[PDB]
Design an enzyme around this catalytic site. Structure first.
Site, PDB file in Angstrom:
ATOM      1  N   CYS A  34       0.828  -1.201   0.000  1.00  8.79           N
ATOM      2  CA  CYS A  34       0.000   0.000   0.000  1.00  8.79           C
ATOM      3  C   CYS A  34       0.865   1.256   0.000  1.00  8.79           C
ATOM      4  O   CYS A  34       1.805   1.393   0.783  1.00  8.79           O
ATOM      5  CB  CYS A  34      -0.928   0.005   1.216  1.00  8.79           C
ATOM      6  N   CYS A  37       0.362   3.825   3.143  1.00  6.95           N
ATOM      7  CA  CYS A  37       1.113   3.357   4.303  1.00  6.95           C
ATOM      8  C   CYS A  37       2.518   3.950   4.316  1.00  6.95           C
ATOM      9  O   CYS A  37       2.967   4.483   5.330  1.00  6.95           O
ATOM     10  CB  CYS A  37       1.191   1.829   4.302  1.00  6.95           C
TER      11      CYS A  37
END
Length: 126
Positions: A34, A37
């Protein structure tokens, strides 16, 4: 036991969870694949800095190595922060910024946040 201080951020596992049911605990579901993140990666580290200072533990969960936890909370959207205070879980509702964090803790803003009552792990009736 766990006397020394290794990394402000604690690594919760499918077994350490229990600990989360004690005192204050700040969790944040992140992902290696991700992008968002990667942006929080630092934002979190900087936070954990004053974390223990404000009397609050900070941990991190992996939605790649811990397939169980992911379900124990039914995390669909990420990143996602969860405030665990004496068992009472409260979803985070902020820009996820070093500054903001502080308040959420010091200003116990969590009080003005609706907790969650979907945790029945432990005493199974079957």
């Amino acid at each position: 036991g766990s006397s020394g201080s290794s990394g402000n951020v604690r690594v919760i596992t499918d077994e350490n969870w229990r600990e989360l049911l004690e005192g204050d605990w700040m969790i944040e579901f992140y992902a290696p694949w991700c992008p968002a993140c990667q942006n929080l990666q630092p934002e979190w580290e900087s936070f954990a800095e004053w974390g223990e200072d404000l009397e609050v533990n900070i941990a991190k969960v992996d939605v790649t190595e811990q397939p169980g936890l992911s379900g124990r909370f039914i995390i669909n959207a990420l990143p996602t922060i969860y405030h665990c205070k004496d068992g009472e879980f409260r979803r985070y509702q902020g820009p996820r910024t070093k500054k903001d964090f502080i308040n959420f803790i010091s200003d116990k803003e969590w009080k003005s946040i609706e907790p969650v009552s979907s945790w029945f792990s432990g005493p199974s009736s079957g």
